[PDB]
Amino acid sequence: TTYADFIASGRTGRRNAIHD
Amino acid sequence: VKEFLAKAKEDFLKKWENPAQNTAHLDQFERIKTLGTGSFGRVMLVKHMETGNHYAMKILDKQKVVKLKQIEHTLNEKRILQAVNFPFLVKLEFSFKDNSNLYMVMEYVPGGEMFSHLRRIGRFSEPHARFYAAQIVLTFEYLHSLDLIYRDLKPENLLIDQQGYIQVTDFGFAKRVKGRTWTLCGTPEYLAPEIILSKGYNKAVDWWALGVLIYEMAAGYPPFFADQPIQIYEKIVSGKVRFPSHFSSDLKDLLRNLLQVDLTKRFGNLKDGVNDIKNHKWFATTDWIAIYQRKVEAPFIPKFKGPGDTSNFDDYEEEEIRVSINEKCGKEFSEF
Ligand SMILES: Cc1[nH]nc2ccccc12
């Protein structure tokens, strides 16, 4: 499931902004 | 609406052209706990000695701001924040600077980040998501009328207050622009295609971001995600979006118009502006006036143990605040 894929991803924590 | 915004703009303009400066000093606050961190600083829960009031103090290391080339963005942030006034925008109470840092003292929002609640709970119901989304819609309507582009919408930047209402924090990428702008900035999952494709863009990017937010709140995960940003960028510009089976047809339709790669067709950017969003079927049960007046009952009210409680926030490693004996980057931040 997409949910399972998300939870297993490295992007479930706080996401940093991108500069430059 | 039009009349309200006109007067709001008069108020904003007076502060925009004559910004408040040096309204407090570090020694007037008692540092209590770190509530969040960032590349060039942190946000701490502090107590104003003279009043006993609690506030959230954002500390920015001037040297780090310069190294990351965020001087203009930081000046934008403070100049804009001290000039705005809306029920869903966190209030900047004081701002000052010393030899080493810049300080922005804002109203403390105890309920914690939407991010925390969304991740823990999994996903919000449509009525729950709709409640928050309505507040963002009104806030963007307010900000855009002032020629302000927000550029950093995400659950991490939205705090829940004691009444269950949202408080937009972090104006680090906010900019007052009448024409188009080109800075590559924001968060991967929330970047509109125009930004990724290195072309001039406008306020429409905020509306795309709203689509990402609503999708994430209702699904529990973003419409475009992967382990590496490049992969996320490929998904965003592809023009493909899949919706969970539980999404109502009205929600899907709103999202397809919000997450529209074609600017001449994206909701919020058409000739009717925000009205195309406000009048959409998904928002049929939304009483915009009541939302603005905070009289609508919130679907979630955070738990509190009293004033200064931080249970709704994660624990961050503490670090001493050292103020150099020498002034750093004085000319760069003279107007702060
Ligand atoms: C927790 C909290 N209250 N107010 C804030 C303003 C910016 C960042 C965090 C905040």
- DSSP calls for B50-90: TTTEEEEEEEEEHHHHHHTT-HHHHHHHHHHHTT---TTB-
Inter-chain Cβ pairs, chain A and chain B, closer than 8 A? 50
Rounded Cα–Cα distance for residues B113 and B100 (Å) = 28
Backbone conformation region of residue B290, classed left if phi is above 0, alpha if psi is from -120 to 50, else beta: alpha
Ligand 1, residue B35: give the atom nearest the CA: 1
Distance separating alpha carbons of residues B260 and B263, to the nearest angstrom:
7
| Coil/strand/helix, residue B182 | coil
| In chain B, where the domains are located | 1-18+113-303, 19-112+304-334
Burial of B26 (0-12, 13-18, 19+ CB in 10 A): middle
Q: Is B152 a catalytic residue?
A: yes
B140: its two tokens: 């963007």
Neighbours of A17 (CB within 10 A): 20
d(CA B155, CA B128): 14
Return the DSSP state at B142: H
Interface test with A, best of B60, B66, B198, B225 (most A CBs within 10 A): B225
Report residue B304 as tokens: 């509190």
CA pair distance B35, B43, nearest whole angstrom: 6
| CATH no. of B19-112+304-334 | 3.30.200.20
Amino acid found at B312: N
Burial of B7 (0-12, 13-18, 19+ CB in 10 A): exposed
- Cross-chain Cβ contact B69/A9 below 8 Å: no
Distance of CA B242 to the CA centre of its chain: 26
Q: What is the number of residues in chain B? A: 336
Contacts of A16 (CB under 8 A, 6+ apart): B39, B187
Strand duo B41-48 + B29-38: pairing = antiparallel
Give Cα B206 distance to the centre of its chain: 11
Q: Which amino acid is at B126?
A: E
Task: Tell me which residue of B42, B49, B46, B52 sits closest to B33, measured CA to CA.
Answer: B46
CB B145 within 8 A of CB B9: yes
Q: Are B46 and B55 in contact (CB under 8 A)?
A: yes
Q: Are the CB atoms for B61 and B98 separated by under 8 Å?
A: no
Whole-angstrom CA distances from B104 to A11, B273, B325 are 29, 33, 21
Report d(CA B192, CA B265) in Å as an integer: 14
Q: Which fold has domain B1-18+113-303?
A: Transferase(Phosphotransferase); domain 1 (1.10.510)
Give the separation between CA B35 and CA B39, rounded to whole angstroms: 14
**Residue B33's beta-bridge partner residues?**
B45
B131-146 exposure pattern, b = at least 16 Cβ within 10 A, e = fewer: bbbbbbbbbbbbbbbb
Mutation choice for B interface testing from A15, A16, A20 by most B CBs within 10 A: A15
What kind and span of H or E run contains B291?
A: helix B288-292
For residue B274 the two structure tokens come to: 């925000």
Which experimental method was this entry solved with? X-ray
CA B29, chain centre distance (Å)? 25
Which backbone phi and psi does B61 adopt, to 5 degrees? -80, 110
What is the side-by-side order of every strand in the sheet holding B92-97?
A: B29-38, B41-48, B53-61, B101-107, B92-97
CB environment B220-254: b (16+ within 10 A), e (fewer): bbbbbbbeebeebbebbbeeebebbeebeeebeeb
Q: Distance between CA B56 and CA B69 in Å, rounded?
A: 25
- CA gap B157, B173 in Å, rounded: 12
Residue B127: exposed, middle, or buried by beta-carbon count in 10 A (0-12, 13-18, 19+)?
exposed
Please say whether the beta carbons of B232 and B189 come within 8 A: yes
Which residue is it, tokens 């302000």? B148
Contact between A12 and B184 using a beta-carbon 8 Å cutoff: no
Task: Establish whether B40 is an annotated binding residue.
Answer: yes
- Measured over the CA atoms of residue B335, residue B70, residue B204 and residue B182, the dihedral's sign is positive
Nearest to B164 by CA among B211, B118, B122, B131: B131
Phi, then psi, of B128 in degrees rounded to 5 = -65, -50
Compare CB distances from A10 to B115, B220, B227 and report the shortest one's residue: B227
Taking CA atoms, B138 is separated from B14, B121, B261, B289, in Å, by 22, 25, 23, 10
Q: Is B178 helix (H, G, I), strand (E, B) or coil?
A: coil
